[PDB]
Amino acid sequence: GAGAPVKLAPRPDKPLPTWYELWWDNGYYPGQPAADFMFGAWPGNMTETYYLRFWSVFGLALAAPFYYVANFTDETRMPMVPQQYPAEVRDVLVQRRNSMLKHDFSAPDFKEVKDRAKIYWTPMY
Amino acid sequence: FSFTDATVENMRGKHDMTSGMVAGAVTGFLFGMGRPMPQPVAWPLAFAGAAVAAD
Amino acid sequence: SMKTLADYIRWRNKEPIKASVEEWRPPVPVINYDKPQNDVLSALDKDPIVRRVLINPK
Amino acid sequence: MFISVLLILFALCVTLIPEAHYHMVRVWSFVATIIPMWVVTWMWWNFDASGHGLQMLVILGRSHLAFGIDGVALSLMLLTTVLFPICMMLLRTVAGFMTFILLEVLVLSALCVLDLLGFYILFEASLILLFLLIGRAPYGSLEAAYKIVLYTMAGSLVLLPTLFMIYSECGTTNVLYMTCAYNHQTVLGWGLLAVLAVKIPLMPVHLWLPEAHVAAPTAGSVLLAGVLLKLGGIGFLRFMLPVVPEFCVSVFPLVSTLCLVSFLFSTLSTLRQIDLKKIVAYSSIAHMSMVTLAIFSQSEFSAYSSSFLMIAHGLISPALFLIVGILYDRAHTKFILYFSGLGASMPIGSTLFFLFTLGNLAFPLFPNFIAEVLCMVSIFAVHELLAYVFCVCQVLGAAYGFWAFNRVVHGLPRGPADVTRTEFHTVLPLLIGAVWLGIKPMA
Amino acid sequence: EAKQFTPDGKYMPGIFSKAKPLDRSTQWVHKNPYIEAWYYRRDHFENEFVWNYRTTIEALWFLGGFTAAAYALSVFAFRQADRRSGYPKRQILGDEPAMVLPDERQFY
Amino acid sequence: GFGGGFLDKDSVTERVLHVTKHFEKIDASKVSPAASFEKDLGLDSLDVVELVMALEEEFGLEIPDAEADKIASVGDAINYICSNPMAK
Amino acid sequence: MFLLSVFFPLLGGLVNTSPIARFLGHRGSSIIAIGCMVVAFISSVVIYYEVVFMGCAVSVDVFGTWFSVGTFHAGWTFNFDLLTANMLFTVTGVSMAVHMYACDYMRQDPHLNLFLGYLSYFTGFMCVLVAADNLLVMLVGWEGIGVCSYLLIGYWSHRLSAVKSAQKAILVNRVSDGLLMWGVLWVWYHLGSLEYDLLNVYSASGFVGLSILIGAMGKSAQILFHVWLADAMEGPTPVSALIHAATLVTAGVYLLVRLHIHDEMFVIIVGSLTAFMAGVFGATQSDLKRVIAYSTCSQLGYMMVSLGLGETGGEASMGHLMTHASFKAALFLAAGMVISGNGGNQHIARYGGSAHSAMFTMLTLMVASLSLIGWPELSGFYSKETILNLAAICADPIADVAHTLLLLTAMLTSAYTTKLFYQCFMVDFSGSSVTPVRNVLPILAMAILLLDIMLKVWVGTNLLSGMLFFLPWGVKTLPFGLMVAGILTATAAVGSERFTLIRFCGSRWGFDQLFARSPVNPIFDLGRITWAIGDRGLLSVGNLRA
Amino acid sequence: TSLDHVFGDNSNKLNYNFEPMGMGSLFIRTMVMVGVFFFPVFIMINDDYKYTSFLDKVAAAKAA
Amino acid sequence: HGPAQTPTVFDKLVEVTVVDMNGIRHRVRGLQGQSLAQALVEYGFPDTYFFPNMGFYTQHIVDAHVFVPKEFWGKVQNVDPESDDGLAVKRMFRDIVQDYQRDTSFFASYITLGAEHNGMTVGIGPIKPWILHSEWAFAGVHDSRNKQFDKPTVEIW
Amino acid sequence: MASEVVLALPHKLRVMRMYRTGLKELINWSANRHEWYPRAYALRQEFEDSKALTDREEIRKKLEHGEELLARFRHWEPLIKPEFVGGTAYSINPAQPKLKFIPNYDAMDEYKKGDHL
C-alpha cells in the first residue's frame, strides 16, 4: 500500500545556528538529529546519570563470578583428566596455546606444559 | 638579553640554543608585562624564535 | 604611550557579537511528559495509585 | 624530443584559429590533447621492464633538461593524459584551452625531468596559470589564488638556496651525479621537505587547497586534485631518497608524526564541512598523507605501493569532482541543504556517486583497496603502531562519506534530473579504469 | 510550450519567444536568505576566533597535546624498530653524531 | 472506488452515531448529526476523551492533541473525519 | 558443477540489475531470480553430497592472481572443503526460499526488481566469501556483503530511521573491518601466505586472536557491537531473514571456525556475556522482529562458546549454525506473513485468534519455535544439547560461569519464544486487520525450510550428533526441564512489580545512549575544534591590510 | 500546512541550544575513547617496560 | 501585472541643487543607482572639480569634493575605517583636502542617489593641488573650460 | 511533570490530556486490550473520587503528583499505528513531487556548453 500522503518539512525562516550541521532534514517531517539521543528527550525520559548509577553496580555484579572462579579454583575441580592420546599424537596437539589438553594435571611435564602456555604480545627480538 | 644568555651559558657549563631560548623568553616577558593578553605569550615566542634563528 | 609595533597588530582578542534576533527551530513531535528522570529508586514506583490502577484490578 | 616539439607547436595553433569556425576550434582543441595520450601509450608499449631502471634517456646539452622514464613517471603521465581530455570537454573559451595546454605541457615536462634545477624551473612555471584560473572574475575567489601562489612561492624560495648549494657542491644538477656525491644532506633535505610538504597537503601548511580546489572550475579542480599533489610524491621518489638518505632517516619520526596528525585532524575536520566541494577537498588530504608515509616507510615495496595509491586517487577523486561540478552547474549552488532525493531525480548519476564514494572508501573490486592494502603492508613492516593508527580511523572517513551521500541522495526529490550523454562520457574513463585496475591491474 | 527547435533539429535560441525558454538555468533553486547568510558566515568563520579561556584550553590540551603524543609514539616506534633489527643507537635530528644508515655489507 | 483517499459522508455519520450511543446516560433518540456533547448529550470531559479514543480505534486514527481538544460536538468530529485521508 | 555455486547467483543479480531488466518486468525478474537460485541450490546440493560424504576437496584457479607484489601474493583461487561445502549449502538453501518469499511479499512494491537484484548480490557475495581460499578474498566477500546489506537496509530511501540504522551498522562493521585488516596484516607478516591451508599456528602473539575475534564480533553483533542488529528491522522482511539466517551474522563465526586461532578465555567470556544479554533482551520487548533478532544474537553467542571450547566444539558450533539458519529464516518469514495479515502491524499487543492467518503459517511457526527452544528430539535440540554437554565437561574453570549463564539464557529463550507464540495466536484478538494471504510461493518457501529442518535431524550435520558423552542423568535432562519452566512461565504470561528493572531491561541497557555521547558527540566536538580553532584559527594566516 | 490537522502542526519547537559540550566531560570522554581504542600502544609500551625492567635486574645482579 | 503605468524616466528622476566654488547655484538631474559624481561630470563641471580615487583596483573611479548638510548624513553608505577601502579614503582626506577639512566633507563616489535624495542640496568643497601622473594633474587653480566629460578615457597609466 | 506547552493548557484541558495520556500509557504497559479494560475502569473511577474538589491548592497538588507519576512512567516503546508519525510504515513510499524535465539539453547551444574563463 504505497503512496501514503506524507507531511513535508517547511523551509526555515530564522537565522540558523552556528553548528546546524547536526540536524538531519530529509525534506519530510519529522526530522531527526545526526544521531539518536544526542540531544533532546530520550524515550522514557531517563538520563545518563541513571544508567551510569545502575551500571556502577551491575557491571561488578556480572564480573564478580569471573574473578572468583579464575582466582580461587583450579583444574582439580573436574572429576576427570582430559582426553588421552598417545605420546606421538598428544605431543603436537598440546603445542597449540588454545589447546585445552594443557589442563591435565596428571601430565608428566604438567607445570612445564602450563609454563609454555602463557601469552605474549610484543614479539621479542 | 645578554646578561641572561651568558648566565645560562655559565650555569649549564656548555653551549647550545637553550640559553638563547631562555634569554628570548625572558626578554619577551619583560617587554610583554602589563599589556593585553594575546601578547605576554606571543612576544616571548617572537624573541625566542628570533634567538633560535640567529643561532 | 610609546607607539610600538603591537599597536599595528590586530590582536584576535575581540569577543564576537551575537544578535538577539530569534533563531530557527525545526518543529518536533510533542511529548506530554518529558521531565528528565534521574533516580533508580523512586517512591513513585511503589505509589498506591499505580497499584490501584495496574496491579489491584482483576 | 622531435615528436614532443611537434606537439608543442601543434598545440599552439589554437590561437591562430579564427574564432568564426567554432566547430573546428573545439575539434582542434580536443585533438591537441588527444595526441599525447596515444604518444604515452606508444611509450608504454615501447618500455622494457626487463631493461634498465631508466629508459628513453635524452639530454639537451649543457642546458640541464635531463629527461628519462621510470614506471612512476610513465604511469603518472598516462593518468594525466587520460584526465586532461575530460577537462577540455568542460571548457568553452580559447583562453582556457591555452592555459590548460600550457599546464599539461609543464606537467609532462616535469614528470620526466631528471635535473633538480630543471624540476625547480619547470614545476612552478604554471603558478601564474593557476592564479589566473582560480580567481576568475564572475565566479572565482582571488583569495584562494593568492593563498596557493604564496604558499608555492614560499616553498620554492626556501628550496632554491639548497638547490644551488648542492649544485656548487657537486658541480652539476643531474640527479645521477647528485646521488653520487657527498653533500651536506641536511640543508637540501629541509628544502625538499618544505617544498614537497607544501605541494602535497600536509599539516600545518596545507590550508590553500580547501579554498583553491573549490573556487576553481570543474576542469581546473580535476587538474589540481589529480595532478599537482602527485608532483609531490614523484618528487620524493625521484629526488629526495636517491639524493639525501640520511636526512630522510633522521626526519622519519617527524614526517611520520606530521602525516599521522594531518590524517587525523583532516578526517575529523571533514565531518563538520557543510558543502560537498569542501568535503571532497578534505578527502584528498588523508590519501596524500598515506602516500607520504608509504614512501617514507621504504620497507618492502614502498615506491610501487605509493604509485598505486597515487594512480588510485587520480582516478577516483576526479570523478567526485565531476559529479560535484555537474550538480553545481545544473544547480547553481554547492550548498548541501539544497540537495535531496537525488536517486529518484538522477538515477545513474546517483549510482555513480555511490560507486565513486565507495572508491574513496577503499573497498574491494577497486584499485584504492589494493592500494591501501599495499601501503599498510609497507607501513606495518616498519612498525605496527602506525599501521594500527591508519587501520583504526578507517571508519571516520567513511562516516562523513556515507552521511553526505545519504543526506544528498535519499529523501525528498528536489533538484536536477539525471545526467546527460556528455556527463556520462566524462564519467566513463574513470569507471572503466578503476574497474580494470581493481580486477586485473597486473598480469 | 515554446519551440526551441525546428521540426528538423536546428536549435532555435528563441530570443523573441513569448514563452520562457528551457535552458541551463532552468532547474536553479531559489536561494533562502537565512541559508545564504549561514553559508557566508561558515565560509567566513575566520573572523570569529578569539583567545578566550575555552579556545586556549582546547588548543593546548588537544592539538598540541596529541601532537606531542604522536611525536613520542613515533620516536618509540623508531627506536623499537631499531632494536628489533639488531642496530645500535641511531642519530635522529639533533642526537649527536652516531650510526646512520646501516651498511648493506654488514650483518647485524 | 470513491474519494481521493476519503470516504463517504454517510458511512462516517452512521459509524459516529453507532459509537455515540455507548453510554448509560444516553437516550438513543437524542443523538443526531451535529449534536452538542456537553450541552445536549450531557457527557463529561472524561466521556469526551473516551469518545475521542473510541473513535480513534473505530477509524484507526492517531488524532493530534490540539485537534482532539477542538472536538466538542458530533458534527465537528464527523467533519474532521471527512477531512482525513488516513481513516479506514 | 563447482563454479556454478558462486558465479550463477552473481550473473543472475547482474542481469536483474542490468538495463536488460527494463525489457523483462517484475514477472520476468522473479522468474530469473528463482531459476538462478534453484540452479545454484542444485549445484550446492551436489557439492555438499560429494564433499561431506565422499570427502573430495577441489581447488580452483579462477582468474589467475589478483595482485602479487613483493612476497605478498593474492590469487583469485577457490577451494571447497567440508567447511566451505557446509556454508555454501546452508546459504543457498536459505536464500532460495528467501527469494521465493520476496517474490510474493513485495508484489505491490514499485521497484521490486532492484530488491531482487540486491538480494542476489548479497547471496553471491556470501558465496564469494565462503569460497575464499586466502584472506584477501575473505575480505572481498566481507565488504561485498556489507555493501549489499547497506543497499538492502536503505532500500526504502524515503525513511530517515532506516538510513540512520544503515549508516550506524556500516560504521560499526567498518570498525570491525579495520580490526580484521590489522589482524590480516599480522597474519601475513608472521606466516608469509594467505591460504588457510597454509595457516597452521600453535602460539601467536595474542594480537592475532584478539583482533580477529573483535572483527568477527563486529559482524556477529556480539557484546559491545549488538546495537545495530535491532535497528535493521527497518528494512524489508526478506532482508532481515537473509541477514539473520545464513549470511553476515554467520560470517564472523565462519571465519573463526576456519581459523581456530583464538584465545579460549576471551571467546568464552564474550560469548557468555552476549548470550545472557540477548536472552534478557528478547523477553523484555513488544516488537516482534526485535525479539527474533535478539534470539539470533543469543544463538550466535552459543556458537561462540562452542567454538571457544575446542576443535570438536568448533565443529559442533558449525553444526549449530547449519541447524539455526533454517528455523531462523522460518521464524522471520512466518512473522512477516502474520504481520502482513495484520495490516502491517509490527506490534504484538494487537493480535489473537486463528482468523488472521493461514493454518500452514501457524504450523510452521510452531515447528520453528519448537526446534529453536530445544524441544526434545528436534533440530536445535541436538546441537544445543551437544554444545551444553561439551560445555558441561570443559577444562576451564571460567567455563563454569558460562555453563550457568547459557542455562539461564536457554530458559529465557523458551520463555520469550512461548510468549511470542502465545501473543500471536493463543490470546484473544486485539487488533484491526484480517487479510489472511494464502499465496502458494511463501507457503512453499516455508515448506522448503521445514523440509531442511527435517533433513538436519534425519541426517546429522557431522559425526558429533549421536556421540554420547557421559553425564549424570539429571544433567542431560536439565535443559529439557528449563524449557519446560519457560513454557510454564510464558503460558502464565505473568510479570513482576520491580518496575525499575523493567524500565532498565526494556531500554536495552542504554547502550545506544552511552555510545551516543561517549564517543560520538566528542567526535563531533573534536571535528569542530580541529577545523575552526586550528585551521581558521591557530593555523590561519590572516591578511596584511594596507 | 494542509496536513497539520492530520499529522501535527509546526507549533511545537525543538528544545536544543546548539552548544558545544562541557569542557571537562568532553576531555574525560576523549581520554576514555583514546584509552579504549588505542590499547595496543599501551600493551606494547608496557611490554617494553617489563622487558627493560628484566634487563635492569639482570644488569644489577650480574655485576657484583 | 495589469494597468501599471508605463516606465518613464520621471519616476527615477532625482534633482540636486549644486553650488560651485564661485557661489553659483546649478540645477542637476540625477538617476537612481548611479553615483552623484557621475551626474556631476554629466552636467559639465570642469575637470578641476575631480580627482582619481586613491584605492586599489579602483583608481579609474573619479570623485568630487562636496559638503553634506546635517539631515542627509545618514544616507551616506557606511565604510569601515579599519578597512583597506577605508584606508584609501583616509589617504584621500590626508592628501587632497588638508586644512580644507570640514565635518561635512564627503566623497560623492559613495553617494548612491535614491528617492530620499530628491531635493537634496550640496556644494563643492575646495581642494589642494595634486598630481597623479603625466596626463592628469591639478595646478591648484580652477581656471579652465575643458569638460571632464570630454576626456575620452580614464588612463590610470 | 508535563511539558511547558501542557503547562499552558487550561485546567480542564490539562486534566483531559492528563487522563488521555494516562490511558495511552496504560495501553502501552498493557499485555492486551483485554487486560487494559479493568485498568481503564479503575482509572476512570479514580478520577471520579476527585470530581467534587474545590480548593485549588489541593487540586494543584493532586494534578502535579499525577503529572510526576506519568512522567516517571513514559513508555520506551509506545504502541503506534504503522502509518502515523513514529510508526514503522510511515514515510515508506510517497508520491513523486512534480519535477520538470529538460529535453535534449546537449542539442542546445552546441560548442558552447563548457566553462567561462
Ligand SMILES: CCCCCCCCCCCC(=O)SCCNC(=O)CCNC(=O)[C@H](O)C(C)(C)COP(=O)(O)O
Ligand atoms: C500509571 C498511572 C500513573 C498515575 C496517573 C494519574 C493518577 C492520579 C489521578 C488522581 C488525581 C486526579 O484525578 S486530578 C483532579 C481532577 N479533579 C479536580 O480537579 C476537581 C474538579 N475540577 C474541575 O474543574 C472539573 O470538574 C474537572 C473534573 C477537572 C473537569 O471535568 P469537566 O470538564 O467535565 O467539567
